[PDB]
Structure 1
């Protein structure tokens, strides 16, 4: 994945998730994408209430993009693999 400052355009299914989180732009840095994804998970309360590094994304549009039912913030490879599939590097 590109570093810092590099601009990316999310594909439509990812952009729809970012829009729920309040994103109004079409072009982002990777860090900004991560900011909106964190906001989305928070707003939808997908994190496990007791073990808050675990995110339960089954039965949510985010799980359809990640292709996993749950993930750990400490093992974020599924998130970055999803971003590689869903970001156009500008």
Structure 2
């Protein structure tokens, strides 16, 4: 069931838009919803599926990189540690 977390408002809005409600979802849920959002808004390449291509989406603007890798999520963790209250997995 639901456990302790606190996000940032422009990141919580990605979480509502990915299918959620409230602001209370742990890093496991946040990353699941980020995967749904990237697939739902189509922020990736069909051959470079390990690579995200948000190009100017509110998610890419908020994270501060408009492209990043699933095997090198460095700007994604950097945004999360500055948005969320430091949830890690």
Q: TM-score range by the shorter chain?
A: 0.7 to 0.9
Instruction: Report if the CA contact (8 A) 1:7-1:89 is conserved.
Output: no
Q: Check if 1:38 corresponds to 2:17.
A: no
Deviation at 1:88, TM superposition (A): 2.6
1:40-75 CA distances to partner (integer Å, 9 max, x unpaired)?
Answer: 001011111111011011210011111112001110
TM-score (norm 2): 0.87
Superposed, 1:1-90 pairs within 5 Å as: 7-88=4-85
Instruction: Report if the CA contact (8 A) 1:54-1:73 is conserved.
Output: yes
Aligned length: 86
Q: Following superposition, which runs of at least 4 residues in structure 1 exceed 6 angstroms of deviation?
A: none
Q: Which runs of 5+ in 1 are unaligned?
A: none
The alignment yields a C-alpha RMSD, in angstroms, of 1.8
Instruction: Report if the CA contact (8 A) 2:80-2:86 is conserved.
Output: no
Cα distance change of structure 1 residues 66 and 15 upon mapping to structure 2, 3 Å threshold: same
